[PDB]
């Protein structure tokens, strides 16, 4: 997002964040106490349903703001209380790269997953469709990209992780969410429906 910077002035009717109806983010130059900043949550635990303000706003919990859910207990890795810090923590479901049951190379999940559960971060560079076109004109052995939306693309060619091998389908069982993660947009992969162990993962490359 576009950070605001209006020294010695609050984030009022003249602040571009307030005008564009967006929260001020980590890199905005307003006070830490800016009323237009995201308040975080005060959940008991989990943070993986619409009852969590962070989850509802497509944001991971912030260790400096989400002080009660377990987001600040960053040293813990087992049966974690906040289920909305996985991208930050580098946690993912166990995945297997193997020949696809359809064709080429595929991804198989090794843990059962519920509808809308987080699977893995999809690593890569978020680039504009203009930079994606520029790259596609001029290359590597094999490139890995998908469309996030009408303006942005994720290129996993230079900075990807295993999940980049998950095949395309117009009837996918996975989807991507562009999420706010400690001031940065990062891509999360979630189950579209409940998936059982051993199932091949697919997502729609046209849009997610
Ligand atoms: Zn502002
Ligand atoms: Zn701002
Ligand atoms: Zn502000
Ligand atoms: Zn929460
Ligand atoms: Zn939170
Ligand atoms: Zn949380």
Numbering used by the authors: 520 to 657, 660 to 729
What does the publication say?
Enhancer of zeste homolog 2 (EZH2) is the catalytic component of polycomb repressive complex 2 (PRC2), an epigenetic regulator of stem cell pluripotency, and expression of tissue-specific genes involved in cellular differentiation and developmental programs.. EZH2 carries out a key function of the PRC2 complex, namely the sequential mono-, di- and trimethylation of Lysine 27 of histone H3 (H3K27) within chromatin. EZH2 contains a C-terminal SET-domain, a conserved feature of histone lysine methyltransferases. The catalytic activity of EZH2 requires the presence of at least two other members of the PRC2 complex, namely embryonic ectoderm development (EED) and suppressor of zeste 12 (SUZ12).
We crystallized and solved the 2.0 Å structure of the C-terminus of EZH2 (residues 520-746). Clear electron density was observed for the CXC, SET, and I-SET domains, and the first 5 residues of the post-SET domain. However, the 17 C-terminal residues including most of the post-SET domain were not observed. The cofactor SAM, present in the crystallization buffer, was also absent from the structure. First, immediately N-terminal to the SET domain, a unique CXC domain, coordinated by 2 clusters of three zinc ions, differentiates EZH2 from other SET-domain PMT structures (no structural homolog of the CXC domains was found by the DALI server). Second, the conformation of the first five residues of the post-SET domain diverges drastically from previous structures of active SET-domain methyltransferases, and folds in a direction diametrically opposite to its expected position, where it would otherwise contribute to formation of the cofactor binding site. Importantly, within the crystal lattice, each CXC domain interacts with a neighboring protein partially occupying both the SAM binding site and the region in which the post-SET domain is expected to reside. Thus, the conformation observed in our structure is not compatible with SAM binding and therefore reflects an inactive enzyme. The EZH2 structure reveals the opposite conformational state that could have similar consequences: a shift in the I-SET domain brings it in close proximity (2.9 Å) to the first 5 residues of the post-SET domain, effectively eliminating the peptide binding groove and sealing the entrance of the substrate lysine channel. Superimposition of our EZH2 structure with that of another SET-domain methyltransferase, EHMT1/GLP, in complex with SAH and a dimethylated H3K9 peptide confirms previous homology models showing that Y641 is perfectly positioned to engage in a hydrogen-bond with the de-protonated ε-nitrogen of the substrate lysine, thereby restraining the rotational freedom of the di-methylated nitrogen atom, and disfavoring alignment of the lone pair with the scissile bond of the cofactor’s sulfonium group, necessary for the displacement of a third methyl group.
